[PDB]
Amino acid sequence: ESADLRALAKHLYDSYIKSFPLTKAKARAILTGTDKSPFVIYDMNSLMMGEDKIKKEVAIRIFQGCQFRSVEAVQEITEYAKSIPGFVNLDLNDQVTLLKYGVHEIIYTMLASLMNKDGVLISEGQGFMTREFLKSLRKPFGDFMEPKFEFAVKFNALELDDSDLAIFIAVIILSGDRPGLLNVKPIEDIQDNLLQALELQLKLNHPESSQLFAKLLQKMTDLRQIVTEHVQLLQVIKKTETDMSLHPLLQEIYK
Ligand SMILES: CCCCCCCC/C=C/CCCCCCCC(=O)O
Incomplete structure (x- = not known):
């Protein structure tokens, strides 16, 4: 019955707001336009003046900053x-x-919420790091954010809001096809109800957006490809920067 699917949609949205401090609605308010203006890091001096107003080569300091935020994100997603x-x-x-495989797909899904074609919000939205500053980072650190930006520009054109995303990231988590699952069926049964909830949610929330449900589901392919590329890029790091620490929670996820 729709009533049960609507109650499930409401439950998930409530938990999403309780679990993720920087929502899409807030990130869009920061990105579009007086008390919420981000400081903008687009070069070496702005970084320095940023590392002062926001608050060990720079490509590595930025890399380990991303890793710290990913870990915090794993905690929120858990x-x-x-x-x-x-x-x-x-x-x-x-x-x-389920968490081990699902967590990075969610990270890049939600990272899209903090992105436009020109850069990404950082430090809980207090800063904005430009896409070109990141792309200009020393090899191989410069190839690192660009595939996420490319996904985000497309994904963001679906114009989902947080209530849609709450159901979608739940769908992602309850994926019966993760390698090594012991009891696929009750996972699938949960995902089927989540899928029903998402379908009703997009119908009601985007009545004129034809086949949005299908188009959203197809995005789960672009997500998988981002992880694969990302995992390759880290292996290069592991060999070229033997002095660089990688956080153990992320190490375990990637194993
Ligand atoms: C410089 C401070 C933070 C800047 C962050 C830039 C983008 C924000 C979020 C990044 C998290 C995802 C990027 C990849 C993380 C590498 C480690 C990992 O998650 O495996």
Whole structure:
């Protein structure tokens, strides 16, 4: 019944707001236009004046900054996952598996919320780092954000809002096809109800957006490709910068 799907949609949106401090609605308010103006980092001096007003070569300091934020993001996504009805009742090994594969797909989905074609919000929206400053970073660190920006510009053209995204990232998490899952069926049963909820949600929230449900589902392909490229790029780092620490939570996820 639709009433149950609407209650599930409302539950997830509530947990999403409770779990993710910087929503898309806020990020768009910062990006579009007086109390919320971000300081803009577009070069070496702005970084310095940024590392002062926002608050060890620079390409590496920026890299380890991204890693720290990814870890914080894994923590937020883990919190959100526990609210998805049924998730914590699954075999503990399947919970770990679902988070291990799902977490970076969610990270780049939600990172799109903080992006426009020209750059990305950082430091809880207090800063804005330009796409060209990142693309200009020393090899191989300059190829690192560009595939995310390319995904975001397309993904953002779907014009989803946070309430849509709350259901979509839940769908992503309850993926029965992750390698090594022990009990695929109850995961699939949860995802099917989530899919029904998403379908109704896009119908009501975007009545004129034909086949938006299908187009959203097809984006789950671009997500997979970003991870694969990202994982390759890290292996290059591991060999060229043997002095660079990589956070253990991220190490474990990637293993
Ligand atoms: C310089 C301060 C933070 C700048 C962040 C720029 C983009 C914001 C978020 C980045 C997280 C995703 C980028 C890839 C992270 C590398 C480590 C990892 O998650 O495996």
